[PDB]
Write a protein that binds this ligand. Structure first.
Ligand SMILES: CC(C)[C@@H]1[C@@H]2[C@H](C(=O)N1Cc1ccc(Cl)cc1)[C@H](c1ccc(C(=N)N)cc1)N1CCC[C@@H]21
Ligand SMILES: [Ca+2]
Ligand code: NA
Lengths: 250, 28, 5
């Protein structure tokens, strides 16, 4: 996260670290949506152009963390993957359309002060909150600059951007399954996700019921925190029928 | 049932340092 | 990264 700040303890208790076993490194962010299910970006697991194709045995999920590098004894929980489910129409060839994946844990994780699931939006949630200028929050252990790494989880709040502005900022074809967020050059504030943060959550706190909802997944961008560029996010509500289908079947 | 309500914040009626920034942006 | 048990 570029131009963010240290998270408070327990501020993002749904935050998940996807941790590569060998070599030991941060792969991506992710989120906890139940005791058994973790949400992330498909590109964290599958991206053939870079020969990325993780299997369940390649990675671990670390939940309840604050420190990036430390083994947080008596606090974090480490979980193994039973199965990965990538959206079948994830468009890795072109524009990362439908950049979403689910991972089922081998055993359910116990909730605690540090570990707790985020809500997923329904249609009404999405209509109410996904409006230009409304702010959400992105968290992660990714790089602090495009070109280093944080001691603890970082947070930044960023406004949703008008769709024409998003479309005009990039040559990539934008779909209804994406939105963009970030400050404009003229706005003076800064902030973005970066390498290590992708797959993590973009959340908003409903002013109606005071709950946090995961509206987006960090999907893609061009560099990090560049003037006139915006981060792109997978639109979680738009892909909820698939999420429900997978959870209902498996 | 309790999704999205943080033990160390909403559950105990404490607010984090920047959630007000989000609220203030929700103007419609 | 610190080793995990
Ligand atoms: C693996 C791939 C998706 C990568 C992927 C994300 C990204 O932007 N990609 C480059 C890319 C490829 C194809 C297309 Cl169409 C757009 C961008 C991702 C990424 C995500 C978000 C931002 C951002 N500045 N908000 C910047 C980068 N990047 C970091 C670690 C994985 C990697
Ligand atoms: Ca364009
Ligand atoms: Na920018």
């Amino acid at each position: 996260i570029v131009e963010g700040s240290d998270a408070e303890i327990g501020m993002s208790p749904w935050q998940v670290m996807l941790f590569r076993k060998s070599p030991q490194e941060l792969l991506c962010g992710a989120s906890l949506i139940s005791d058994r299910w973790v949400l992330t970006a498909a590109h964290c697991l599958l991206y053939p152009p870079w020969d990325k194709n993780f299997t369940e045995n390649d990675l671990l999920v670390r939940i309840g963390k604050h420190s990036r590098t430390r083994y947080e004894r008596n606090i974090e929980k480490i979980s193994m993957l039973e199965k990965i489910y990538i959206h079948p129409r994830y468009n890795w060839r072109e524009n990362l359309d439908r950049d979403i994946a689910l991972m089922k844990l081998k055993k359910p994780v116990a909730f605690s002060d540090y570990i707790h699931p985020v809500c997923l939006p329904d249609r009404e949630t999405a209509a109410s909150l996904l409006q230009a200028g409304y702010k959400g929050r992105v968290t992660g252990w990714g790089n602090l600059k495009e070109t280093g790494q944080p001691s603890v989880l970082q947070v930044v709040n960023l406004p949703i951007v008008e769709r024409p502005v998003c479309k005009d900022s990039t040559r990539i074809r934008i779909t209804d399954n994406m939105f963009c967020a970030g400050y404009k050059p003229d706005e003076g504030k800064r902030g973005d996700a970066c390498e290590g943060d992708s797959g993590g959550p973009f959340v908003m706190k409903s002013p109606f019921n005071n709950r946090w909802y995961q509206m987006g997944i960090v999907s893609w961008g061009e560099g990090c925190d560049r003037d006139g560029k915006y981060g792109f996010y997978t639109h979680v509500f738009r892909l909820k029928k698939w999420i429900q289908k997978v959870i209902d079947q498996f | 049932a309790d999704c999205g309500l943080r033990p160390l914040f909403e559950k105990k009626s404490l607010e984090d340092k920047t959630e007000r920034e989000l609220l203030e942006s929700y103007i419609d | 990264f610190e080793e995990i048990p």
